[PDB]
RNA sequence: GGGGAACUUGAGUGCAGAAGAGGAGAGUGGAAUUCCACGUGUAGCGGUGAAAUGCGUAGAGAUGUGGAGGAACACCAGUGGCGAAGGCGACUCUCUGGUCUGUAACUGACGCUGAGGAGCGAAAGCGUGGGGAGCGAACAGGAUUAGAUACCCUGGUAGUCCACGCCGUAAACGAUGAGUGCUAAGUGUUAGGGGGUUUCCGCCCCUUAGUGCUGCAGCUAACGCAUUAAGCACUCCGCCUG
RNA sequence: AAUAAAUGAUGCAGACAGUACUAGAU
C-alpha cells in the first residue's frame, strides 16, 4: 500500500494535481478488485469481501458510463490502457 | 471516581506492566468492573486485552 | 514492526541457553529479519503451573520481518523443547 | 437528490408558519426569487431579501403576522410535481377559493398569478396553490 | 371570542343514544342527548348531555350548547369558499351554491346548516357517519372559514383588489 | 466460599458473618448456581440487560 | 425535454488520524464435564411434592496425582460496539470489507430508486467422509393420574461439531421499505474535532455519525410516535380491497 | 473483653346448556 496508488496516480495524472481523475479512480478500483480476487480464489467463503467487490465494480461501471457519455476519446484511451474487457 | 490513564496521560498499556495489571485485577484474579475501576470504555477494552495476554503468558493467574 | 516474547525451560545451563538464543536468532535472520531490540527479564515465577516447571526464563526480541521468519520461529518453538511458550505481536 | 426545490421550499415555509417563525434560509434559485417577490407584492410576506454568496446564493423570508395571532399563509400545496405535470389553459385557469387565495402559474410570458394569467389570456404550469 | 347566549334560539335535537354501565348488580342505563342550538342569523353551537332521564339530558345538552356558540360568515346566504373538516375520522366537504339550490346534507349536517341560517349549501360526507363526529367536523370546517373583508385587512389589500 | 484468609480469636458466628458478606464478590452464588438448567441464548442475553440494569439482585 | 458553456452545496478520489465480537484461513490456551489408571477410604451414591427405575461389597461416591479426548470461551459485559440482513464475544498471526472525524487539493451532477435477474441468507433438514465430552427428538424403563403415546426421574439413537454440496423457510419484528429537506426542549452514552484558563488532571460551550429515556407543536381510532417519527413534503419500489 | 438471623422449591383438581330473558321521548 502507498505505492500502487502513487504509481497509478503519477501514470494517469492529466494535471499536476489531478486526483479526482475518473480514470485514476477506475485504475485504483481495478487494482483493488484484482488484489481482492487474488485472495478470494482461496477464501471462497468470504461473502462480505464479495459484496465489497460488487460495490467497487458498480462504482467502476458508473464511472465508465459517465466517461463514455462525457469524452469517448478518453474513454477509449482508458480502455486501451487498462484492458477492462 | 477518577480514571487512572486519563489522570496519568499514559499510552498503550504495554501489558508487560505486571504490577499495574495486578493492582487493576481483583485479588481473586477476576477482572474488576469498569464501575469500580473508574476507567473509560476504551481503556477498559485495552485492559481486558492486556490481562488476557498476561494470563496467556503466565504473568497473572487464572484461578486463585 | 513486530515483537516476539518466549519462555525457556528453567533446567538449562547458561551456555545451552545462549546457544538456543543464538540458534533462534539465526532462524529469525534466515530471511533477513533485523533484531531491533532484545531484553531478558531473567528468572520469574510463573503465575500458574506448566508442563513440569513453576518458573522459567523470559526472553523479549524486537523484529521487523515479512511474516515468514515469524512462522519459522513459531513452528520451531512449538517443536523444540527448549521453549515452552511464545507469542508474536505487531508493534503497530 | 431531493427531486425538487420548490416543494421543499413550500413545505419549509409551511413549517415556519406552523412554528410561528420569523426567518428562513433557502438556496434562492431564480424561480424561488420570483415566487417570493410574487408573495411579497401579494401581501403574504412582510419583506424578502436576497443574499448572493459564493456557494449558491441565499434568500431570507420574513413571515407576516399582521394581527395578534394569525397565520397569513394558512396552507400551501404544490400541483405540478416532478412526475405528474399539470398544464392549464387560458380558459381553464383556476381560482383559489372563489378568488380569495392565489395560485402561481408559469406562463409563456413570465411567471404570473391566476388573475394575471386570466387577464393576459395565457396558461401553463400550475406549480402551487395558496390559501 | 365567546358569543353570549342572550339571543333567540331554535334549539333542535339530533339523536338520543342509550348507553349502559355494567355493575355488580347489573347494567345501569343512562341516556345521552345530542342537541344543536343556534339562530338563523349566523350563530350556532353544539352541546351534549347525559342523565338517567330524557328531558333532563336534553336540558343539560341545551345548557351546554348555549355556552359553546360560534359565529359563521353568511356571504350571500352561503359560505365564502369551500372547505373540509377532518375532526376524528370524519371528513365533510362544504361547497357554496346558488340562490335556489337549497340545503343538501345528511340529517345532522343539514340540521346544523339550517339552524345556522344558511339556505344554499352543497355537502357530502366522506368518512364515518357518526353524528358526534359529523357535527364536530362541520363545526371545525365552519370555524376555518375566512371573510373577504377580514382577509383583505389581513393581507393589507382592498376587497376589490382580491375579488378582481 | 469466601476466601483463603484466616481469622482467629473470634466467636463461631463472627466468622460466618464475614463469610456471608465476602461470598457476594465471587461467582460461588451466581456463576455456579445459575447453570443448573440450560438457558437459551436469547433469554441468556436478555437476562443481563434486565438484571445488571434494573438492580433487582 | 434536447444540444452548447460555466459553478459547488449533491456525489466520489486523496491527505493525517479513530474504534470496532466485520469476514475467511492457520496456531495456541486454562478453567469445567466425562472416562481411564493408581494411593487413602465404607455402605451407600443419585433423585422427586413423595417414591421408584438406575450405579455400588468383582469395592461406589469423596479425596489426591497423571493421562485421553470433544464443545464453548467466566469475570471484562454495559439497550456497549460492528455488520446491508441473518448474525458476530478467549488469545496470537496471514489475506481482506466497510465506517467516522477536518477535508477543500482534486473531477464537477458523475445522483436516488429499481420490475425482471444474480448473490447472500437463523434454526431445523438432506447427501458424502470423518468425529462424538456433555446435552438430547425418537425409543426403553420407573412414577402421578380414571386414563398419560406428556409435564418429573433414570439411560439413550439421529442431531448438536468438522470439509464440500443442497434446501431457501422464521414472531427473519422496530409487526414501522430506500433517499433527501424542515419541524421546541431536557437527558445519559460510544468514537472524534474546535474553543474558554490550566503543561495537566479536569470543568464549561460549540460542532460531527451512531446508540437510549422523558417530552411542545403536529399526527393518530386510541394505544402511542415525536430530530433515529408513526409530524410537514417530494421521487421510486412491494403489498392491501370482508 | 465483646458478640452476631438463619433456612427455604410444594403434588392433584377433567366437563356444564341446545333453544331462554327488561321498553324511551322535549
PDB file of C-alpha atoms (C1' of nucleotides) in Angstrom, chain G residues 14-197:
ATOM      1  C1'   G G  14      -6.526  11.729  -1.863  1.00  0.00           C
ATOM      2  C1'   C G  15      -4.429  13.774   2.558  1.00  0.00           C
ATOM      3  C1'   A G  16      -3.475  12.652   8.896  1.00  0.00           C
ATOM      4  C1'   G G  17      -5.896  10.034  12.423  1.00  0.00           C
ATOM      5  C1'   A G  18     -10.082   6.667  15.294  1.00  0.00           C
ATOM      6  C1'   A G  19     -12.931   2.490  17.016  1.00  0.00           C
ATOM      7  C1'   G G  20     -14.986  -1.894  16.449  1.00  0.00           C
ATOM      8  C1'   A G  21     -17.421  -9.813  18.848  1.00  0.00           C
ATOM      9  C1'   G G  22     -16.712  -7.465  10.278  1.00  0.00           C
ATOM     10  C1'   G G  23     -15.367 -11.958   7.336  1.00  0.00           C
ATOM     11  C1'   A G  24     -12.235 -16.399   5.581  1.00  0.00           C
ATOM     12  C1'   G G  25      -7.790 -19.233   6.891  1.00  0.00           C
ATOM     13  C1'   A G  26      -3.684 -21.244  10.376  1.00  0.00           C
ATOM     14  C1'   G G  27      -1.636 -21.983  15.536  1.00  0.00           C
ATOM     15  C1'   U G  28      -2.177 -21.553  20.922  1.00  0.00           C
ATOM     16  C1'   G G  29      -4.643 -21.527  25.628  1.00  0.00           C
ATOM     17  C1'   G G  30      -6.590 -22.647  31.043  1.00  0.00           C
ATOM     18  C1'   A G  31     -10.979 -23.181  33.892  1.00  0.00           C
ATOM     19  C1'   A G  32     -15.152 -27.047  33.728  1.00  0.00           C
ATOM     20  C1'   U G  33     -17.721 -32.064  32.424  1.00  0.00           C
ATOM     21  C1'   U G  34     -16.931 -37.391  31.139  1.00  0.00           C
ATOM     22  C1'   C G  35     -13.770 -41.718  31.030  1.00  0.00           C
ATOM     23  C1'   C G  36      -9.376 -44.366  32.248  1.00  0.00           C
ATOM     24  C1'   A G  37      -5.056 -45.830  35.762  1.00  0.00           C
ATOM     25  C1'   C G  38      -3.290 -45.580  40.603  1.00  0.00           C
ATOM     26  C1'   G G  39      -2.734 -44.243  46.681  1.00  0.00           C
ATOM     27  C1'   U G  40      -6.352 -43.324  51.054  1.00  0.00           C
ATOM     28  C1'   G G  41     -11.012 -44.820  52.169  1.00  0.00           C
ATOM     29  C1'   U G  42     -17.004 -47.518  53.685  1.00  0.00           C
ATOM     30  C1'   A G  43     -22.252 -48.569  52.764  1.00  0.00           C
ATOM     31  C1'   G G  44     -24.296 -46.292  50.485  1.00  0.00           C
ATOM     32  C1'   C G  45     -24.465 -42.660  45.647  1.00  0.00           C
ATOM     33  C1'   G G  46     -28.128 -40.039  42.595  1.00  0.00           C
ATOM     34  C1'   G G  47     -33.084 -38.303  42.512  1.00  0.00           C
ATOM     35  C1'   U G  48     -38.550 -36.474  43.395  1.00  0.00           C
ATOM     36  C1'   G G  49     -44.005 -32.952  46.116  1.00  0.00           C
ATOM     37  C1'   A G  50     -43.162 -38.257  47.884  1.00  0.00           C
ATOM     38  C1'   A G  51     -41.173 -42.759  45.598  1.00  0.00           C
ATOM     39  C1'   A G  52     -39.085 -45.915  42.418  1.00  0.00           C
ATOM     40  C1'   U G  53     -36.317 -47.250  37.943  1.00  0.00           C
ATOM     41  C1'   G G  54     -30.856 -46.564  37.897  1.00  0.00           C
ATOM     42  C1'   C G  55     -24.822 -47.306  39.995  1.00  0.00           C
ATOM     43  C1'   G G  56     -22.400 -49.571  44.250  1.00  0.00           C
ATOM     44  C1'   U G  57     -19.226 -55.380  48.739  1.00  0.00           C
ATOM     45  C1'   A G  58     -15.662 -58.037  41.302  1.00  0.00           C
ATOM     46  C1'   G G  59     -15.249 -52.045  46.479  1.00  0.00           C
ATOM     47  C1'   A G  60     -19.141 -46.887  44.862  1.00  0.00           C
ATOM     48  C1'   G G  61     -19.287 -41.682  45.891  1.00  0.00           C
ATOM     49  C1'   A G  62     -15.482 -38.450  48.032  1.00  0.00           C
ATOM     50  C1'   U G  63     -10.406 -37.195  48.260  1.00  0.00           C
ATOM     51  C1'   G G  64      -5.166 -36.569  45.603  1.00  0.00           C
ATOM     52  C1'   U G  65      -1.931 -37.326  41.076  1.00  0.00           C
ATOM     53  C1'   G G  66      -1.457 -38.245  35.884  1.00  0.00           C
ATOM     54  C1'   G G  67      -3.317 -39.183  31.167  1.00  0.00           C
ATOM     55  C1'   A G  68      -7.176 -39.287  26.903  1.00  0.00           C
ATOM     56  C1'   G G  69     -10.410 -36.938  24.135  1.00  0.00           C
ATOM     57  C1'   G G  70     -14.697 -33.298  22.426  1.00  0.00           C
ATOM     58  C1'   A G  71     -17.906 -28.463  22.670  1.00  0.00           C
ATOM     59  C1'   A G  72     -17.966 -23.480  24.330  1.00  0.00           C
ATOM     60  C1'   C G  73     -14.990 -19.279  25.682  1.00  0.00           C
ATOM     61  C1'   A G  74     -16.381 -16.991  33.220  1.00  0.00           C
ATOM     62  C1'   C G  75     -15.039 -12.230  35.326  1.00  0.00           C
ATOM     63  C1'   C G  76     -14.280  -7.586  31.436  1.00  0.00           C
ATOM     64  C1'   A G  77     -20.209  -7.440  29.765  1.00  0.00           C
ATOM     65  C1'   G G  78     -22.912  -2.127  29.625  1.00  0.00           C
ATOM     66  C1'   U G  79     -30.338  -1.082  25.237  1.00  0.00           C
ATOM     67  C1'   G G  80     -21.689  -1.027  24.727  1.00  0.00           C
ATOM     68  C1'   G G  81     -19.688  -1.975  19.560  1.00  0.00           C
ATOM     69  C1'   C G  82     -19.614  -3.880  14.137  1.00  0.00           C
ATOM     70  C1'   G G  83     -22.201  -5.720  10.031  1.00  0.00           C
ATOM     71  C1'   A G  84     -26.958  -4.347   4.403  1.00  0.00           C
ATOM     72  C1'   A G  85     -29.770  -8.639   6.906  1.00  0.00           C
ATOM     73  C1'   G G  86     -29.230 -13.314   9.311  1.00  0.00           C
ATOM     74  C1'   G G  87     -25.579 -12.663  12.678  1.00  0.00           C
ATOM     75  C1'   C G  88     -20.941 -11.776  15.249  1.00  0.00           C
ATOM     76  C1'   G G  89     -17.917 -12.446  22.330  1.00  0.00           C
ATOM     77  C1'   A G  90     -10.779 -16.417  24.656  1.00  0.00           C
ATOM     78  C1'   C G  91      -5.609 -15.342  22.878  1.00  0.00           C
ATOM     79  C1'   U G  92      -1.726 -14.867  18.579  1.00  0.00           C
ATOM     80  C1'   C G  93      -0.885 -14.280  13.326  1.00  0.00           C
ATOM     81  C1'   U G  94      -1.754 -14.094   7.186  1.00  0.00           C
ATOM     82  C1'   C G  95      -5.366 -12.041   3.402  1.00  0.00           C
ATOM     83  C1'   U G  96      -9.215  -8.815   3.462  1.00  0.00           C
ATOM     84  C1'   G G  97     -14.592  -5.289   3.569  1.00  0.00           C
ATOM     85  C1'   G G  98     -16.999  -1.101   5.253  1.00  0.00           C
ATOM     86  C1'   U G  99     -17.493   3.179   8.635  1.00  0.00           C
ATOM     87  C1'   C G 100     -16.455   8.264  11.327  1.00  0.00           C
ATOM     88  C1'   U G 101     -13.595  12.670  12.158  1.00  0.00           C
ATOM     89  C1'   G G 102     -11.029  18.498   9.447  1.00  0.00           C
ATOM     90  C1'   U G 103     -11.233  17.714   4.239  1.00  0.00           C
ATOM     91  C1'   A G 104     -11.022  21.579   0.005  1.00  0.00           C
ATOM     92  C1'   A G 105      -6.485  19.789  -3.036  1.00  0.00           C
ATOM     93  C1'   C G 106      -8.876  17.256  -6.783  1.00  0.00           C
ATOM     94  C1'   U G 107     -13.476  15.690 -11.297  1.00  0.00           C
ATOM     95  C1'   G G 108     -17.696  18.684 -11.422  1.00  0.00           C
ATOM     96  C1'   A G 109     -24.403  16.264 -11.307  1.00  0.00           C
ATOM     97  C1'   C G 110     -20.730  11.547 -12.446  1.00  0.00           C
ATOM     98  C1'   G G 111     -27.134  11.297  -8.028  1.00  0.00           C
ATOM     99  C1'   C G 112     -31.868   8.215  -5.671  1.00  0.00           C
ATOM    100  C1'   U G 113     -34.965   4.194  -6.616  1.00  0.00           C
ATOM    101  C1'   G G 114     -35.148  -0.183  -9.113  1.00  0.00           C
ATOM    102  C1'   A G 115     -39.956  -4.823 -12.308  1.00  0.00           C
ATOM    103  C1'   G G 116     -37.229  -8.935 -14.217  1.00  0.00           C
ATOM    104  C1'   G G 117     -32.174 -11.174 -12.764  1.00  0.00           C
ATOM    105  C1'   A G 118     -27.901 -12.642  -9.636  1.00  0.00           C
ATOM    106  C1'   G G 119     -25.879 -13.266  -4.961  1.00  0.00           C
ATOM    107  C1'   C G 120     -26.235 -13.831   0.385  1.00  0.00           C
ATOM    108  C1'   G G 121     -29.449 -15.795   3.820  1.00  0.00           C
ATOM    109  C1'   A G 122     -31.224 -18.024  11.788  1.00  0.00           C
ATOM    110  C1'   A G 123     -32.588 -22.663  13.256  1.00  0.00           C
ATOM    111  C1'   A G 124     -34.197 -27.250  11.533  1.00  0.00           C
ATOM    112  C1'   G G 125     -33.470 -30.887   7.484  1.00  0.00           C
ATOM    113  C1'   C G 126     -30.818 -33.938   3.427  1.00  0.00           C
ATOM    114  C1'   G G 127     -26.357 -36.352   0.745  1.00  0.00           C
ATOM    115  C1'   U G 128     -20.873 -37.762   1.018  1.00  0.00           C
ATOM    116  C1'   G G 129     -16.358 -38.886   4.847  1.00  0.00           C
ATOM    117  C1'   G G 130     -14.845 -38.038   9.491  1.00  0.00           C
ATOM    118  C1'   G G 131     -15.749 -37.044  14.944  1.00  0.00           C
ATOM    119  C1'   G G 132     -18.532 -37.603  19.268  1.00  0.00           C
ATOM    120  C1'   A G 133     -17.041 -34.723  26.188  1.00  0.00           C
ATOM    121  C1'   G G 134     -21.754 -33.050  27.849  1.00  0.00           C
ATOM    122  C1'   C G 135     -26.921 -32.000  26.152  1.00  0.00           C
ATOM    123  C1'   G G 136     -30.576 -34.526  23.769  1.00  0.00           C
ATOM    124  C1'   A G 137     -36.318 -35.539  19.283  1.00  0.00           C
ATOM    125  C1'   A G 138     -37.446 -40.969  18.509  1.00  0.00           C
ATOM    126  C1'   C G 139     -37.003 -45.005  21.939  1.00  0.00           C
ATOM    127  C1'   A G 140     -36.791 -48.431  26.921  1.00  0.00           C
ATOM    128  C1'   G G 141     -37.770 -48.347  31.955  1.00  0.00           C
ATOM    129  C1'   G G 142     -39.599 -46.066  36.885  1.00  0.00           C
ATOM    130  C1'   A G 143     -43.623 -42.582  38.922  1.00  0.00           C
ATOM    131  C1'   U G 144     -48.590 -39.308  39.063  1.00  0.00           C
ATOM    132  C1'   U G 145     -53.480 -39.800  37.012  1.00  0.00           C
ATOM    133  C1'   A G 146     -59.752 -42.945  35.775  1.00  0.00           C
ATOM    134  C1'   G G 147     -56.584 -42.891  31.622  1.00  0.00           C
ATOM    135  C1'   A G 148     -50.661 -40.182  30.258  1.00  0.00           C
ATOM    136  C1'   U G 149     -48.416 -42.479  23.466  1.00  0.00           C
ATOM    137  C1'   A G 150     -46.978 -35.632  28.231  1.00  0.00           C
ATOM    138  C1'   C G 151     -45.439 -32.366  32.095  1.00  0.00           C
ATOM    139  C1'   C G 152     -40.999 -35.475  36.761  1.00  0.00           C
ATOM    140  C1'   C G 153     -36.791 -39.137  37.192  1.00  0.00           C
ATOM    141  C1'   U G 154     -33.039 -42.830  35.150  1.00  0.00           C
ATOM    142  C1'   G G 155     -30.436 -44.355  30.369  1.00  0.00           C
ATOM    143  C1'   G G 156     -30.437 -43.079  25.434  1.00  0.00           C
ATOM    144  C1'   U G 157     -30.000 -43.254  18.793  1.00  0.00           C
ATOM    145  C1'   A G 158     -30.026 -39.319  14.975  1.00  0.00           C
ATOM    146  C1'   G G 159     -28.748 -34.373  15.800  1.00  0.00           C
ATOM    147  C1'   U G 160     -25.611 -30.777  18.082  1.00  0.00           C
ATOM    148  C1'   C G 161     -19.104 -30.289  15.662  1.00  0.00           C
ATOM    149  C1'   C G 162     -15.616 -30.522  11.283  1.00  0.00           C
ATOM    150  C1'   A G 163     -14.754 -30.097   4.864  1.00  0.00           C
ATOM    151  C1'   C G 164     -17.929 -29.902   0.316  1.00  0.00           C
ATOM    152  C1'   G G 165     -22.781 -29.538  -1.733  1.00  0.00           C
ATOM    153  C1'   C G 166     -28.218 -28.982  -1.451  1.00  0.00           C
ATOM    154  C1'   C G 167     -32.854 -26.845   0.758  1.00  0.00           C
ATOM    155  C1'   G G 168     -34.099 -21.143   0.873  1.00  0.00           C
ATOM    156  C1'   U G 169     -38.163 -21.285   5.204  1.00  0.00           C
ATOM    157  C1'   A G 170     -38.915 -17.975  10.915  1.00  0.00           C
ATOM    158  C1'   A G 171     -42.802 -13.528  15.848  1.00  0.00           C
ATOM    159  C1'   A G 172     -36.152 -13.431   9.518  1.00  0.00           C
ATOM    160  C1'   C G 173     -40.164  -7.815  14.412  1.00  0.00           C
ATOM    161  C1'   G G 174     -38.718  -1.866  15.391  1.00  0.00           C
ATOM    162  C1'   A G 175     -45.063  -6.489  13.318  1.00  0.00           C
ATOM    163  C1'   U G 176     -42.543   0.701  11.016  1.00  0.00           C
ATOM    164  C1'   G G 177     -39.027  -0.102   2.670  1.00  0.00           C
ATOM    165  C1'   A G 178     -34.823   3.221   0.420  1.00  0.00           C
ATOM    166  C1'   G G 179     -33.096   8.703  -0.324  1.00  0.00           C
ATOM    167  C1'   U G 180     -33.440  13.967   0.733  1.00  0.00           C
ATOM    168  C1'   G G 181     -35.069  18.715   3.302  1.00  0.00           C
ATOM    169  C1'   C G 182     -37.709  21.276   7.524  1.00  0.00           C
ATOM    170  C1'   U G 183     -40.054  20.890  12.213  1.00  0.00           C
ATOM    171  C1'   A G 184     -39.369  23.287  20.641  1.00  0.00           C
ATOM    172  C1'   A G 185     -36.637  21.045  24.537  1.00  0.00           C
ATOM    173  C1'   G G 186     -34.099  18.146  28.992  1.00  0.00           C
ATOM    174  C1'   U G 187     -31.416  13.788  29.025  1.00  0.00           C
ATOM    175  C1'   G G 188     -27.291   9.761  29.642  1.00  0.00           C
ATOM    176  C1'   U G 189     -23.916   7.099  26.111  1.00  0.00           C
ATOM    177  C1'   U G 190     -19.779   5.480  22.007  1.00  0.00           C
ATOM    178  C1'   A G 191     -15.619   7.353  18.552  1.00  0.00           C
ATOM    179  C1'   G G 192     -13.894  12.234  17.222  1.00  0.00           C
ATOM    180  C1'   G G 193     -12.935  17.613  16.338  1.00  0.00           C
ATOM    181  C1'   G G 194     -12.664  23.111  17.831  1.00  0.00           C
ATOM    182  C1'   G G 195     -12.557  26.701  21.718  1.00  0.00           C
ATOM    183  C1'   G G 196     -12.743  29.491  27.135  1.00  0.00           C
ATOM    184  C1'   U G 197      -7.989  29.490  31.858  1.00  0.00           C
TER     185        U G 197
END
